[PDB]
Coordinates of C-alpha atoms in Angstrom, one line a residue:
Chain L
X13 CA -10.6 -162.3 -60.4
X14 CA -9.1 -162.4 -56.9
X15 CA -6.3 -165.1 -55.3
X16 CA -8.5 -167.0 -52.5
X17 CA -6.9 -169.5 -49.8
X18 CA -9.2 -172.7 -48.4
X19 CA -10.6 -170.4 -46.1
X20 CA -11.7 -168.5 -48.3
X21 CA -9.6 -165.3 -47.5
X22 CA -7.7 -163.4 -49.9
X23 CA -4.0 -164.2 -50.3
X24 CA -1.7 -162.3 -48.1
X25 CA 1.6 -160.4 -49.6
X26 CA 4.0 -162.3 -47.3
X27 CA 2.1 -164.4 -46.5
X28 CA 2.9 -168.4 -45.3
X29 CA 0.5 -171.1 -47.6
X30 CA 0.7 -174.8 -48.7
X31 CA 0.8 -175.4 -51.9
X32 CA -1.8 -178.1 -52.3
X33 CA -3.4 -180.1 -55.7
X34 CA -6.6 -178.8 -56.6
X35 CA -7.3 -182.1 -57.7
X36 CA -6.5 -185.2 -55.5
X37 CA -5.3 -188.8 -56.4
X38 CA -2.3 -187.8 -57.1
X39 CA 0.8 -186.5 -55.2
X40 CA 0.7 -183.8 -51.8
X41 CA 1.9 -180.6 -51.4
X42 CA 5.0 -178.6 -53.1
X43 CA 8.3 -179.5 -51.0
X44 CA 12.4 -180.2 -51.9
X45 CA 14.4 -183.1 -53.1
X46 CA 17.5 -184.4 -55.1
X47 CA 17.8 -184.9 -58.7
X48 CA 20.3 -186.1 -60.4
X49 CA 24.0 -185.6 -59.1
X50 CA 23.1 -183.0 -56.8
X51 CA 23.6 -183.7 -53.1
X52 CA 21.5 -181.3 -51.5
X53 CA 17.8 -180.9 -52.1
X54 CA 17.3 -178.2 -54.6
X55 CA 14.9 -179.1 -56.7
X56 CA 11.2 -178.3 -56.0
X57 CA 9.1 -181.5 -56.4
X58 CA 5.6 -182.5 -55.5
X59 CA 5.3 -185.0 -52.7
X60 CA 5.0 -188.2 -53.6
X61 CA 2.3 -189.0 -51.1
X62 CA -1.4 -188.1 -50.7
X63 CA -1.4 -187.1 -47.1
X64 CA 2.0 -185.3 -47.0
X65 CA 1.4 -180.7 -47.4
X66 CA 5.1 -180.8 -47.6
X67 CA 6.7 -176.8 -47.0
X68 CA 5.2 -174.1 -46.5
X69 CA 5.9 -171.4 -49.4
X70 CA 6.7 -167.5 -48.3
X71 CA 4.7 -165.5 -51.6
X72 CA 5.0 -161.9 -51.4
X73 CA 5.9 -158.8 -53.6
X74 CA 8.0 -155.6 -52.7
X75 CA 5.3 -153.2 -52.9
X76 CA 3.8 -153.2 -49.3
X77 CA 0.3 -153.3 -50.3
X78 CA -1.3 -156.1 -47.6
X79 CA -3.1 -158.4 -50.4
X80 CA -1.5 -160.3 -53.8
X81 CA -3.3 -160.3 -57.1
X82 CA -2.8 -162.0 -60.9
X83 CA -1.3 -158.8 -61.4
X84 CA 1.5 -159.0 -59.1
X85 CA 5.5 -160.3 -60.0
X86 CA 5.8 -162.9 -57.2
X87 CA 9.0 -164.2 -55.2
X88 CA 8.5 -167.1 -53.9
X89 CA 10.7 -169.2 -51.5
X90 CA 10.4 -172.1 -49.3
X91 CA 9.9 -171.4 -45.7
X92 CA 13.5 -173.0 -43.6
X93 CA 12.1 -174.5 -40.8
X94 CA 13.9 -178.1 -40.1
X95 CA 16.2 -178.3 -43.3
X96 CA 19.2 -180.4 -44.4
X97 CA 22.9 -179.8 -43.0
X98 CA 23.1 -178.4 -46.7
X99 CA 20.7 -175.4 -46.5
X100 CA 20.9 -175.2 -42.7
X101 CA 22.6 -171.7 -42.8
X102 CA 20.8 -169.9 -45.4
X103 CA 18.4 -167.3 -44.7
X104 CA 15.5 -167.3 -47.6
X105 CA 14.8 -169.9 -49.8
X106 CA 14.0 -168.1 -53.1
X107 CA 12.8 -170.2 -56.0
X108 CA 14.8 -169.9 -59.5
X109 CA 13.6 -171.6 -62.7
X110 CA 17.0 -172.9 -63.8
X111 CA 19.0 -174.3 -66.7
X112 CA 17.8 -176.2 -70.5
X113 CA 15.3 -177.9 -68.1
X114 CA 13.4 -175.1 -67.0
X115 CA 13.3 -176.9 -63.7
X116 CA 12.3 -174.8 -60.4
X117 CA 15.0 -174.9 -58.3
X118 CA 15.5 -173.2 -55.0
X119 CA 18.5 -170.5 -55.5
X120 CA 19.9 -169.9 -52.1
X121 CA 23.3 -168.0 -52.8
X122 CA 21.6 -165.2 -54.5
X123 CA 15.9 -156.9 -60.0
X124 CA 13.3 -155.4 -58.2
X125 CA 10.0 -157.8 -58.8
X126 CA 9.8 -161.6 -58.7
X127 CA 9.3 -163.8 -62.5
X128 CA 6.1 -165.8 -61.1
X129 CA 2.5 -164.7 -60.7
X130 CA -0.2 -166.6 -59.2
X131 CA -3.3 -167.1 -61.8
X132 CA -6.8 -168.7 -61.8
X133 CA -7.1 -172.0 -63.4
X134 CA -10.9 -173.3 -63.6
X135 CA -12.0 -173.3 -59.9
X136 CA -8.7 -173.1 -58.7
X137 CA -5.7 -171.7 -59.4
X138 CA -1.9 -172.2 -61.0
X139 CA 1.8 -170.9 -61.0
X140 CA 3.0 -168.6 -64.3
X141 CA 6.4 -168.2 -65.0
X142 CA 7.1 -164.6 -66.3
X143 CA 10.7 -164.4 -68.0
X144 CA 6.1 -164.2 -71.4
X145 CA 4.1 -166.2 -68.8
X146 CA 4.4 -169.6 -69.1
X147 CA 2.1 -172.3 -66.8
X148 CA 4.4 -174.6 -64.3
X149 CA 3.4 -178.1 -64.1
X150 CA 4.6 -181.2 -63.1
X151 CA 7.4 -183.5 -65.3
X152 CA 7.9 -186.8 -63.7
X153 CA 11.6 -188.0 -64.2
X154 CA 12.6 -191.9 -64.9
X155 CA 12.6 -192.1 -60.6
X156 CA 9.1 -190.9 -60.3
X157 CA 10.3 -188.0 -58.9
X158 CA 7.8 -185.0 -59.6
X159 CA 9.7 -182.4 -60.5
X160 CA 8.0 -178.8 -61.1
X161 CA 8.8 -177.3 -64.2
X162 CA 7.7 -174.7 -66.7
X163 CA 5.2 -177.0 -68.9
X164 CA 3.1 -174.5 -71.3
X165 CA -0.4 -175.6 -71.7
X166 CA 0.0 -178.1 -68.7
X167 CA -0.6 -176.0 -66.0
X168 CA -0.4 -178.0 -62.0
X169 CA -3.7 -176.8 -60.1
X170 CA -2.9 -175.7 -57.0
X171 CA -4.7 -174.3 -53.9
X172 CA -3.9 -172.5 -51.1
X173 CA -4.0 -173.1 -47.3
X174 CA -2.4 -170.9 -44.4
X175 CA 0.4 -172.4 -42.4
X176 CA -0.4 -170.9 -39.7
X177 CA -3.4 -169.2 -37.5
Chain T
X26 CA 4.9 -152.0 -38.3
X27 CA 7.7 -153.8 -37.5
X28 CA 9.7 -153.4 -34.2
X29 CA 7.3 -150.1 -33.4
X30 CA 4.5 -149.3 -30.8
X31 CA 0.7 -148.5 -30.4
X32 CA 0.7 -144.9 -31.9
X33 CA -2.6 -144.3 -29.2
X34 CA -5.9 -143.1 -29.5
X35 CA -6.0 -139.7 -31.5
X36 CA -2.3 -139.5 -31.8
X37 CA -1.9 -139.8 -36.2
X38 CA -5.5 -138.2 -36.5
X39 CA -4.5 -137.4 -40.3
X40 CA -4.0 -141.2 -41.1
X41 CA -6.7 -143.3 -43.3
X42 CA -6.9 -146.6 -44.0
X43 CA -8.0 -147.9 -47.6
X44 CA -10.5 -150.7 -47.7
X45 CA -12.0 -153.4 -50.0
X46 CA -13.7 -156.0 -47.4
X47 CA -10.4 -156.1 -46.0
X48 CA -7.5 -153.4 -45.2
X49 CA -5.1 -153.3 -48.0
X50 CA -3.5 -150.0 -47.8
X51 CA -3.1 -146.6 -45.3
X52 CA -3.5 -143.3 -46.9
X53 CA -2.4 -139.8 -45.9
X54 CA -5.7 -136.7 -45.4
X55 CA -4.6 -133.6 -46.7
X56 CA -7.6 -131.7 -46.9
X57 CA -11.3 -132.6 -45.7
X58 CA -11.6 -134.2 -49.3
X59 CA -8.1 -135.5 -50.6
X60 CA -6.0 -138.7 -49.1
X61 CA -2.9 -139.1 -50.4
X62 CA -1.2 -143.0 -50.6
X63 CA 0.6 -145.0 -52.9
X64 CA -0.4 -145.6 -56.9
X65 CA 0.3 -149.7 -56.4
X66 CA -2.8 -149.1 -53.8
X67 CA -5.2 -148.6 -56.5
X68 CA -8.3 -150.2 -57.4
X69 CA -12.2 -149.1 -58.5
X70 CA -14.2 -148.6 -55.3
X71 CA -12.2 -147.9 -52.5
X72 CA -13.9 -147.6 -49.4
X73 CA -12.0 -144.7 -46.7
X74 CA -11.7 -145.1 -43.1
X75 CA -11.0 -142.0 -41.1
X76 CA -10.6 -141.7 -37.2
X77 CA -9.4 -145.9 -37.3
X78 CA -7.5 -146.9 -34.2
X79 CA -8.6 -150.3 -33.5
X80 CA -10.1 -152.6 -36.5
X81 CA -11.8 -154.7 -35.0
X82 CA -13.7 -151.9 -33.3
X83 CA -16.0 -149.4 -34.8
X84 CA -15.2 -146.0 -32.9
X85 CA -17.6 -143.3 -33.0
X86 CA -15.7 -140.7 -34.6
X87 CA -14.6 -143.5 -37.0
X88 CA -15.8 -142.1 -40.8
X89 CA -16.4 -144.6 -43.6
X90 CA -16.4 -142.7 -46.8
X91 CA -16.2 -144.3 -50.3
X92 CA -13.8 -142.3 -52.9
X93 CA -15.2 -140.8 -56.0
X94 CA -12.2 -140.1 -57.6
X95 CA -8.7 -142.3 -57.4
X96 CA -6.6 -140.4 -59.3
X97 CA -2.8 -142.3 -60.1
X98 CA 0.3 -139.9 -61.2
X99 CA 0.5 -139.2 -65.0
X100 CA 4.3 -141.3 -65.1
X101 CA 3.6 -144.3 -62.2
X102 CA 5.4 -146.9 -63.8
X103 CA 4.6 -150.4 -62.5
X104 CA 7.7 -151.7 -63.4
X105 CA 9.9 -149.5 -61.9
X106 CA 7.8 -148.1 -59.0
X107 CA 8.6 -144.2 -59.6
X108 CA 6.2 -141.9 -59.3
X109 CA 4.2 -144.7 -57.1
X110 CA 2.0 -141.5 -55.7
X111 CA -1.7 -141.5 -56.0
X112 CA -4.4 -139.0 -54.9
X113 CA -8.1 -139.9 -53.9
X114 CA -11.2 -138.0 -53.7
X115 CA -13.6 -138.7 -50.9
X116 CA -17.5 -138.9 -52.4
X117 CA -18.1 -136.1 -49.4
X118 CA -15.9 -134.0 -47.5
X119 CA -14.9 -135.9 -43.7
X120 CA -15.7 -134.1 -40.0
X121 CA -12.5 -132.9 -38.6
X122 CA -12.3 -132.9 -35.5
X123 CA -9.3 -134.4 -32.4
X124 CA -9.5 -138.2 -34.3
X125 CA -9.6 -136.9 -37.8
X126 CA -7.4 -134.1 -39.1
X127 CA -5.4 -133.0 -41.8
X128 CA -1.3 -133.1 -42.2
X129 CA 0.9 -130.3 -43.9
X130 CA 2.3 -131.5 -47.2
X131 CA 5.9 -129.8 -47.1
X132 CA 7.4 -126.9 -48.9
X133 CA 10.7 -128.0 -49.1
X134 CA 12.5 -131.8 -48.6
X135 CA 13.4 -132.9 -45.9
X136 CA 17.2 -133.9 -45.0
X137 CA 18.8 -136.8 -43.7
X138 CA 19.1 -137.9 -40.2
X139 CA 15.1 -135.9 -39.8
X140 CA 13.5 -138.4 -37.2
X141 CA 10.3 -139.1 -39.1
X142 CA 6.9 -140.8 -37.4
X143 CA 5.4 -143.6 -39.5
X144 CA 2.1 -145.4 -39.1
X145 CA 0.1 -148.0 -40.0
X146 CA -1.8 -151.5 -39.5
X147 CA 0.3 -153.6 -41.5
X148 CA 2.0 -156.9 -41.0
X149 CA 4.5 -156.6 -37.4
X150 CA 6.3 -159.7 -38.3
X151 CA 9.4 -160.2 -40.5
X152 CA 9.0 -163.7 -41.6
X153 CA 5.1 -165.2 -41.7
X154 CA 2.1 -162.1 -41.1
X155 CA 0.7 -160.7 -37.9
X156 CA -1.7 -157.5 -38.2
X157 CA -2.2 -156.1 -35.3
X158 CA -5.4 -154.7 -34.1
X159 CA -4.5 -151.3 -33.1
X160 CA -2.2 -148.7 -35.0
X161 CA 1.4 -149.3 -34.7
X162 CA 3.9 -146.4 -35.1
X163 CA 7.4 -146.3 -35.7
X164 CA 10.2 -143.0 -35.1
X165 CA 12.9 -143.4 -38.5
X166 CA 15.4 -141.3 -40.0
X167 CA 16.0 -140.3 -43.5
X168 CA 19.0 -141.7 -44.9
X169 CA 21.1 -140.1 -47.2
X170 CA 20.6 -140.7 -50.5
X171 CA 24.5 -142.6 -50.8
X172 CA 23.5 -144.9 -48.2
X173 CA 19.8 -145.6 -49.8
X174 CA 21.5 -146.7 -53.3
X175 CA 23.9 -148.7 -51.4
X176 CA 21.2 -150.8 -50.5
X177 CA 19.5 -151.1 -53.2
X178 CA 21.7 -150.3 -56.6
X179 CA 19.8 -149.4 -59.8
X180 CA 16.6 -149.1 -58.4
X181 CA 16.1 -145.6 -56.6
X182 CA 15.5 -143.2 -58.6
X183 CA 15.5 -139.4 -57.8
X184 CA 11.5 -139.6 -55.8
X185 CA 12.0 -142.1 -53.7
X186 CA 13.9 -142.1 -50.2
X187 CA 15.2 -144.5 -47.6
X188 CA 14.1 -144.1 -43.7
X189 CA 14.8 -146.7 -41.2
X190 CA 17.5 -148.9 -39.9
X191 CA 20.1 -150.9 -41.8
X192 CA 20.7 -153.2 -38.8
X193 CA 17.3 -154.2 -39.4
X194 CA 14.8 -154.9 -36.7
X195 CA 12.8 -151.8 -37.4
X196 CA 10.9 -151.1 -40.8
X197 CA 7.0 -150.8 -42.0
X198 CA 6.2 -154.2 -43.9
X199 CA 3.4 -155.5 -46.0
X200 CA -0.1 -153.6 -45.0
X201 CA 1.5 -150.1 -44.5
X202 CA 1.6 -149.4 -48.2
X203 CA 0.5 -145.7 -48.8
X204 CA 0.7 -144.7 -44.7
X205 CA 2.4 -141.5 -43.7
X206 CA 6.0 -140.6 -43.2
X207 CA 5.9 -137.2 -41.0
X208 CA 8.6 -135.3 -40.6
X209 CA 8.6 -132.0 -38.2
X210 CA 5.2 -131.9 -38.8
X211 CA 5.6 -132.1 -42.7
X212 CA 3.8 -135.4 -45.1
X213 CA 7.7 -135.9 -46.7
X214 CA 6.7 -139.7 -47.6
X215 CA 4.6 -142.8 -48.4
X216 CA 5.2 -146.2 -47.9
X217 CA 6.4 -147.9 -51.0
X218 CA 8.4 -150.9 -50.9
X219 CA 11.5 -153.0 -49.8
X220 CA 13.1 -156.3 -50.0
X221 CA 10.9 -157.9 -47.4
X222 CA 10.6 -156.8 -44.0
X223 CA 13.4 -154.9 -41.2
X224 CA 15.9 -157.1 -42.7
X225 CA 19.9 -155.8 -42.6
X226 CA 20.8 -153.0 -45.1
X227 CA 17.3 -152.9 -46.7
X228 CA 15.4 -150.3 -45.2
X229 CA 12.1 -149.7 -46.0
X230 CA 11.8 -147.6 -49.6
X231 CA 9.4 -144.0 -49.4
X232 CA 8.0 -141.8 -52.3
X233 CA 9.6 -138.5 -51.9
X234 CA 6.4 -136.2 -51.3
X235 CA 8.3 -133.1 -51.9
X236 CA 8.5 -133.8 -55.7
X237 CA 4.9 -133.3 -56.0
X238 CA 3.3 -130.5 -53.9
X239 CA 2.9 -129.1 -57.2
X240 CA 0.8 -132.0 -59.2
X241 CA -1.1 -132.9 -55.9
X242 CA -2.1 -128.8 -55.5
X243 CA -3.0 -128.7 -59.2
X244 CA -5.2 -131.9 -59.2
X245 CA -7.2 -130.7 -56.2
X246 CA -8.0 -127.6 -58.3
X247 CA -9.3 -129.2 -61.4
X248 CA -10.7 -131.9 -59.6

């Protein structure tokens, strides 16, 4: 199987996408926010509202091929356009899956492949963790905050759409 | 390309481009038969475009030739990306003429500070994608091998060399996978990899050609 945006058109290694429910009803697109005790936004959550695409994701591998596949290790990171104080200086935006919580978290102070790949998922598609693979889905904390984590056998269903063009 | 310039019209008549629907990869012609590009190009039914300039264009000395043979080195290793060299025979032998022609694999490496010409269609921007619609071309030199594993420790082995610019600004990118790096008139490369895109002290990571005159030369014979 092939990695297919909205339009259609096969995913592009470095490429600029929303990350967007398959589904709708419930939540918007992939974006940041605080958990916790942390006092800068460095969890990746799902927005809250319907309507909302949230940030843009940057998905590419370091093999210069023009195209992604299941096949590929992924980085991913967050796109920095209008960001906190807190991350305003930063360059990328990689994501991390971090701590007890297996939470993805955007690591910005820091091998040669990525640990995600992109995988179909019915007539969509969903995020695999590859520490193997392991599905990322969504854990809602006591605040209703919609934090994505790795969540085996609960996969979020996700579908692409450019940022840009 | 990043931070390069339209090659021209019959100017890299030796590069190829590899197609599925879409342009995925570039590819090196060594003989009327054989391309040479990188092993993480591969897939089953690649289609071969010879005498490309502009893509959205179809130019009359333009060739479309499907491979019949995509043969990967014995040792690629997926993980680690050596050996990322792969070999592809073309279902019928190509014209050659000014627009398509073949380049010199080398007989011996080349050194650093060579001023090599790379080529290909792929993404020109360093953050986001832009493919551009003609071939984009870029001058590079070798680095030594000292500087190469500065930049990226642990993970160059012995057949793969750096070319570019550690300010950053110039570099191929996503698209130019398995394009040429010619040196003096010599094939001494193929775009492999980096950590993204002309950024500072990453260049742009190439499979050292040299290492394999002998398996290409022996795999044309038998095949």
């Amino acid at each position: 199987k092939e990695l297919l945006d909205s339009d259609g058109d096969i995913l592009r290694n470095g490429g600029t996408y929303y990350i967007l429910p398959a589904l709708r009803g419930k939540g918007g697109g992939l974006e940041l926010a605080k958990t916790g005790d942390e006092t800068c936004p460095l969890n990746v959550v799902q927005a809250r509202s319907e309507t909302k695409r949230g940030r843009p994701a940057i998905i590419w591998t370091p093999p210069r091929i023009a195209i992604l596949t299941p096949a590929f290790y992924l980085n991913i990171e967050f796109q920095t356009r209008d960001l906190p104080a807190c991350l305003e200086e930063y360059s990328r935006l990689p994501w991390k899956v971090e701590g007890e919580s297996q939470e993805v978290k955007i690591a910005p102070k820091e091998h040669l492949f990525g640990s995600f790949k992109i995988k179909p998922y019915r007539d969509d598609y969903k995020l695999v963790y590859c520490e193997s693979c392991k599905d990322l889905g969504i854990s809602i904390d006591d605040e209703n905050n919609r934090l994505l984590v790795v969540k085996d056998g609960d996969p979020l269903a996700v579908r692409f759409v450019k940022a840009h063009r | 390309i990043v931070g390069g310039y339209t090659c021209g019209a019959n100017t890299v008549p030796y590069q190829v481009s590899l197609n599925s629907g879409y342009h995925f990869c570039g590819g090196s012609l060594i003989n009327s038969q054989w391309v040479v590009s990188a092993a993480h190009c591969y897939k089953s039914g690649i289609q071969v475009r010879l005498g490309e300039d502009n893509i959205n264009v179809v130019e009359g000395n333009e060739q479309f030739i499907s491979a019949s043979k995509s043969i990967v080195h014995p040792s690629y290793n997926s993980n680690t990306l050596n050996n990322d060299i792969m070999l592809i025979k073309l279902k019928s032998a190509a014209s050659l003429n000014s627009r398509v022609a073949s380049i010199s694999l080398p007989t011996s490496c080349a050194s650093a500070g060579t001023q090599c010409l790379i080529s290909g269609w792929g993404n020109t921007k360093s953050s986001g994608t832009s493919y551009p619609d003609v071939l984009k071309c870029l001058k590079a030199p070798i680095l030594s091998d000292s500087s190469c594993k500065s930049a990226y420790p642990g993970q160059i082995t012995s057949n793969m060399f750096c070319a570019g610019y550690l300010e950053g600004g110039k570099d191929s990118c996503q698209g130019d996978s398995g394009g040429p790096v010619v040196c003096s008139g010599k094939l001494q490369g193929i775009v492999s990899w980096g950590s993204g895109c002309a950024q500072k002290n990453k260049p742009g990571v190439y499979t050292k050609v040299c290492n394999y005159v002998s398996w290409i030369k022996q795999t044309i014979a038998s095949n």
